[PDB]
């Protein structure tokens, strides 16, 4: 897939297209149904199927710092919008380009000029030129002989409106399940692993891996959850017994540094650290609130109640395969 | 109108003065009885009427930095006692003379020696010498025969008590319009504008001018608020269509950054960038809560409800004309 | 009392010992119970009491900054022992030794090698070896025929169990009347003194003294509270009319830095100025929480009811004399 | 005079200008020479005079953080465009907008759509475009019968190039009069005034007004200097005896910060002043001295005395200069 | 290659070792003398080869935050370690065990008791037990019989000690020539690329890729430097026309910031290219230039394209010298 | 001794003094001449002997956070003042009072209204009222009848002149011996023990003791120096083999950090304890080296020995001198 910064970066010869447009973040559900009619036209045509998204969040520019959470990084959005089929990646700066053009020299540039597009889907709440004069029903005219367009409604599903405000607010209230099911696949982070307390290994009260992410993105309630950790492929010598690309049944543990979060991984049934490596955290379930510890025992105790319901929940998890890991580890006990 | 720092810088040969004593913040409703009655009594007698004043708050003396908020600067309050007719303000620091003197030394070095008092206006709730020790009533009868004490009641009506604090309470509730009313004027804050967000012009999401203030300065709670935008007298240049002199209406959002607060103002129906200038921003009324965003679009929806509040609510306050400004700019639509 | 840290640090050749295990973290009644099971049983048999105790905590050992807040410093816990009747104090650090050890092998080099222990008292909560396995009973068991062990109960009293979590709660919700009750001595804090707002002396709204402590220290709650304060034994110079070695009632003013807390103590009838000195704060009493003042008068009013209820409550605190101070300053009135 | 974000805020509804384009920071005498050209050939047709300029310095766009340092703010640009009498400036964000386009492209957009241009007047070095393409040269052949094209060698005087990076040399060595040489003015800097140390009134240790400025603000290197204070334009009452739109004898104290800032510390001759919340300008005429420790009073009092003296000397030879002295001013030959 | 954590995490089960100890940082050309005597020695015998290293660095432990700067991380030493045969880490830490213990009891314990080894290899430099009590000597005498101890001469090679000390020095001056040639290779650091300034694309003053590193990296000096990058291998998608598995011939800036923070930025030459979220390495080759300021963007350009210039020709005498060259690259001689 | 501050505190009881007036930073040499004249009158007529000091620092008034070192604390100063025999210190604040006055109105208010002085001593550079008007000429004329004023010259000896100044720069050289010299005692800082690396044990390169002090406090230039340690009276439990009240032999390590914060690190000879939580004064006798990095644990340890026998040197020197040693102290010829 091509990932462009820019309409200028775009190649001027660029046959034909088939493009949506968006932010895209979480590419969720309703993303989901975007990119599948985007992708299916532009087989129909031979056709490439682009994606217009942009960076920095629309948002953002007018109000700088307040942007939303992200729920996935750019990176991720690019790594998920190629697994489900595109070809191309437009990615556009709005204090670069496009955010003063009218409604009418926004199309003829960035869908004609730019992209030669034949056909293009886009959301009912997506809108577009100077101070969002254009909306989808402006787009269809503006249309009407030049190109096709075809407008997605909202995504509805068990009287909850999937977008990318619902995801964050599941994840906000650690309700990492009901986000799941928004985003058609467990939520996740990918990172590179510290040093934390202690070593990874044989103690169960050192994690076998600390990560830190920055405040901008979204990350569930603090808490702990079930899910699973799989260190990404890699060539590099692993500290104790876990493998590569396999994915480790694990209590998870997000803080918050007293806005910078940290997420801490008890794998479990693994003597293992895993410092350098990059490690994705999949979550499917909250287990419970953060809780202050006054003793060793009390801490350890409690530990060991996380790893039991983690057990519970991620046996459970395995049977919603659509959602699980192709290769997982999880132990039926200790 | 004369400012003097300390005693020591008060001419020798000052002839006759009428004095009034307090903290005068905000110069409410209350401290326009005292500086009347005694602008009348110097009138009278051909003398100055002098304000006596304390910088830094008195209370930040014992308990520094949990001093009380400055509903004016220091620099306001003398330009509103010139207003309202004080010739000279003598402005005493506690930490340098009169803390701990008795109230008879407090009185004859002060009011006699340094002031020659022939009057002198104090509120009920006045307090001086060490431990605070003499109240009005005391400064009655010390000066028996000496010189006339005129001592005024605290400010009650419509059953609110009028005082520094009750007006500090209603700007942190962002019940500016009650703020106003113990005033008895616009509440407003002076100063520079700085870059912000984009440009301030043809983009409505962009505010016409951003400021930031320190977190002694009192105002209002985060919220959107309606209000007049001056431009304070200049020669400098000015971005786009707006004049010098002219109180603009503007949809007012108070923030803070995460104690230091951010000003910024829509300016209704205006395009202009007022980086570099000097500024007033004048509060008229509450229109709504801060909110988060997730779209440009759901942004702007709000943004335009906010203009249109604010046109309601200032073309209701130009009828106040006591309140109003003199020459304002403020279109029936957009 | 010796103090060694870490086993290599006691000496080779000592004869013989009975020892008690634990955080002892506020040396508080229960604690009592086992220091003095184990100096009455090393007296018995002509052997040194040692206490066998942790730094750092062994929480903050899996949960780095998360750690309990100390109730008293670890050199205070070294003076408490000692006044207790406690020979030795082993000094444990759970990330140098004796974190991955075995029950066993724990007890092994532990009591035996490195102690040459006959009798060994530990709590019913008392926990030990990797994973915390071990317990009050595996204790009885490995040292059956080997050394005595005794296990004593958690001490309740008035229905509440008397902990270092107890005490905390109760510092934490500013009763440190219970907490007191559970220390079976006035909780106190000792520091140097530095320079505050404005000078100790004729003033009564400066404080005698101020004082400032580390986040990990605990303290009660931001308030008032009446106590005494203590110059500890000192040649130095006292600016005015307090004494070394005698608890002045003082009304005490704990507050947040805007977590590093301060501790102001207004001694009564006193005008001195301990700038340089050490100084311990004994806490008797809670006054009244925080308020913010927005008139000198209105901060002096209060200040003087502090007082009031601070001598009411300091002459009760006398007539409970086991833990009131042997020499001590209050007047009758001012 | 208008001021202009971006080639999209400019009016439709012009239709011919005259047009300089530079940074044109400090706005010095090499600069002049581009204005006077423009203004004098703008009053000659019909056609207002417009001045491009950039902000944020084309250089920071590269490498931020790394900016040099402002001789004036964006803002006293403006001022010093207007006074030169520019009747529009045009201000490019490169982060916007031109920096992508192609010599060909950046021509007929800035000088023939936006501004329909019929003359334009650039510098020697003048550079524009796509990786620094376009040239003086490149220039004036794109342009052949609709603009005329007038190139200015940059200014030699005295054997001395005189640029903003002279210019910002020779603030940094402390040498303001050579500063001055070369902007055809005092240096200043303007800003509001706070609480520093005591009260402005008869003792003379505690300065008259502080200032604080960003590491932004290109500033003499640390030391005492000869200058004017003048309190700008206002109806704000003034603490002490002086007023404002008058140039005050001053014995100027550049300062740092570990917090980054600068500080300007105004003591002004034989006034008994305290300054706190106007806006005041502060002109620099000479160096004085370096800056020094005191460890007494006495010592401190001493060298302030003898910063005083100085000051009344080389201000009374700046009076006596003519040429960059201000219109109304106060000084004192005696204490 | 397995990675133990204290004598704890190494298998009771291990039944025969060869042993080489040491901190290793940078595993220079003495360091791989050390590791192939005990490889080769270690399949001679049917037994395990295996490292002892330290961390954190026994320095530091006596000296907080004085440690040397990492040559390599910690990271990359067991990457390296393994390149070279090893079949355990074993990594000590000095707040943990071994640091009490005497001469007598360091060798029991550690390379009998844990380890069970035959045969040891150690530099003469060598220092083991309370107080650096323990030497090359003091170590073959406690051993006889049971364990052969191979010490090795610190290496020396065209009159230049090759330590640690001398590499951080070669870094330190901005000579990565030395510095590599001391190590056996290009010296190399690795990191997520990050954002920067611009988009990486066209424009040649922006960047291909920004990282940034802790104050503990030993990194060159602040200057340009030849170099390769090398895109790690991934499946995620590359904006741009670079492939991963490929070293992209670079200029490469290094730089400082107030936050600490040491910096570096990768202009790959002949590629439009944005490398934000991928894992590079980055190869040092030669020194190109010291550290300067820029006050024009014609200036800058002028300067990055002399650059390029400079690391075609050093680069390309770096593929001819074969030795350190990387096996597929990226090189034009021609823009 | 008493301690006032401000005139107020004063008793009005006070009917006849003896005054001294200086800021006494240090008590040196030269400041012991002034105290010495001052008491012995004192003692002559029935009066008490007054010190008048200033906090904070005169300098600190006109010119925050521009105030010299303290070479002592304000503490340190009561209770040098107060071994020499000193009654009263007053400690007048210049924010508060006698800043704005007139000499005339100066003497008065503070040597005969407060103090109700007979006799003055003062140093020769002495110096008082409105912008250091008044003088010890100026002193010695308005205080006819009433008051004998003694003016005492600075202290000469050996080609050297002993000032607060003077003792600043020996310090900040790191020459103690001459600061030592200059003061008529062995330089020392007093403060809490905190913990910092490993724990005093057996180990020699973990510290016997830690502390931190504030950029306030003059302290000598970073390095390695010989100096005694003492643990001040208390009934706190000792770990280790150390007394209360015995100054012990120790080489003493003065660095520096980010945060501001100066540190010093004793090594106290031949003792194996943990200071934390006591209050300990270390004492400065001689420099022995500058600082340096170290990149191996056997090299640090190579050195610290080094260090101990060129403080047992030193350290038998300052015993065999005599006149600055300690009462009781502890050092050992031999390890």
Same mark, same amino acid.
């Given at each position: 897939?091509?990932?462009?910064?820019?309409?200028?970066?775009?190649?001027?010869?660029?046959?034909?297209?088939?493009?949506?447009?968006?932010?895209?973040?979480?590419?969720?559900?309703?993303?989901?149904?975007?990119?599948?009619?985007?992708?299916?036209?532009?087989?129909?045509?031979?056709?490439?199927?682009?994606?217009?998204?942009?960076?920095?969040?629309?948002?953002?520019?007018?109000?700088?710092?307040?942007?939303? $959470? %992200?729920?996935? #990084?750019?990176?991720?959005? @690019?790594?998920?919008?190629?697994?489900?089929?595109? +070809? *191309? &990646?437009?990615?556009?700066?709005?204090?670069?380009?496009?955010?003063?053009?009218?409604?009418?020299?926004?199309?003829?540039?960035?869908?004609?000029?730019?992209?030669?597009?034949?056909?293009?889907?886009?959301?009912?709440?997506?809108?577009?030129?100077?101070?969002?004069?254009?909306?989808?029903?402006?787009?269809?005219?503006?249309?009407?002989?030049?190109?096709?367009?075809?407008?997605?409604?909202?995504?509805?599903?068990?009287?909850?409106?999937?977008?990318?405000?619902?995801?964050?607010?599941?994840?906000?209230?650690?309700?990492?399940?009901?986000?799941?099911?928004?985003?058609?696949?467990?939520?996740?982070?990918?990172?590179?692993?510290?040093?934390?307390?202690?070593?990874?290994?044989?103690? $169960? %009260?050192?994690? #076998?891996?600390?990560?830190? @992410?920055?405040?901008?993105?979204?990350?569930?309630? +603090? *808490? &702990?959850?079930?899910?699973?950790?799989?260190?990404?492929?890699?060539?590099?010598?692993?500290?104790?017994?876990?493998?590569?690309?396999?994915?480790?049944?694990?209590?998870?543990?997000?803080?918050?540094?007293?806005?910078?979060?940290?997420?801490?991984?008890?794998?479990?049934?693994?003597?293992?650290?895993?410092?350098?490596?990059?490690?994705?955290?999949?979550?499917?379930?909250?287990?419970?609130?953060?809780?202050?510890?006054?003793?060793?025992?009390?801490?350890?105790?409690?530990?060991?109640?996380?790893?039991?319901?983690?057990?519970?929940?991620?046996?459970?998890?395995?049977?919603?395969?659509?959602?699980?890991?192709?290769?997982?580890?999880?132990?039926?006990?200790?």
């Amino acid at each position: 897939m091509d990932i462009w910064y820019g309409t200028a970066a775009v190649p001027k010869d660029l046959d034909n297209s088939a493009v949506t447009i968006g932010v895209f973040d979480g590419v969720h559900r309703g993303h989901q149904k975007l990119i599948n009619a985007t992708v299916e036209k532009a087989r129909e045509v031979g056709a490439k199927a682009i994606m217009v998204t942009f960076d920095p969040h629309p948002v953002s520019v007018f109000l700088p710092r307040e942007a939303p $959470l %992200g729920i996935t #990084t750019l990176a991720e959005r @690019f790594a998920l919008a190629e697994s489900f089929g595109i +070809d *191309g &990646v437009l990615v556009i700066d709005f204090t670069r380009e496009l955010s003063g053009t009218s409604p009418e020299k926004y199309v003829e540039f960035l869908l004609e000029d730019t992209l030669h597009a034949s056909h293009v889907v886009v959301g009912a709440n997506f809108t577009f030129g100077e101070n969002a004069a254009g909306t989808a029903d402006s787009l269809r005219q503006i249309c009407q002989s030049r190109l096709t367009v075809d407008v997605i409604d909202l995504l509805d599903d068990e009287g909850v409106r999937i977008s990318s405000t619902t995801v964050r607010e599941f994840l906000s209230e650690g309700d990492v399940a009901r986000a799941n099911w928004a985003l058609g696949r467990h939520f996740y982070v990918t990172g590179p692993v510290v040093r934390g307390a202690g070593r990874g290994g044989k103690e $169960l %009260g050192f994690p #076998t891996a600390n990560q830190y @992410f920055h405040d901008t993105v979204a990350l569930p309630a +603090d *808490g &702990v959850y079930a899910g699973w950790l799989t260190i990404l492929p890699t060539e590099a010598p692993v500290s104790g017994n876990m493998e590569p690309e396999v994915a480790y049944a694990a209590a998870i543990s997000v803080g918050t540094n007293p806005e910078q979060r940290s997420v801490e991984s008890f794998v479990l049934d693994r003597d293992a650290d895993l410092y350098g490596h990059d490690v994705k955290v999949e979550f499917v379930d909250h287990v419970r609130a953060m809780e202050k510890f006054d003793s060793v025992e009390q801490l350890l105790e409690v530990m060991a109640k996380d790893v039991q319901k983690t057990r519970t929940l991620l046996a459970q998890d395995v049977q919603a395969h659509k959602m699980a890991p192709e290769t997982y580890f999880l132990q039926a006990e200790s």
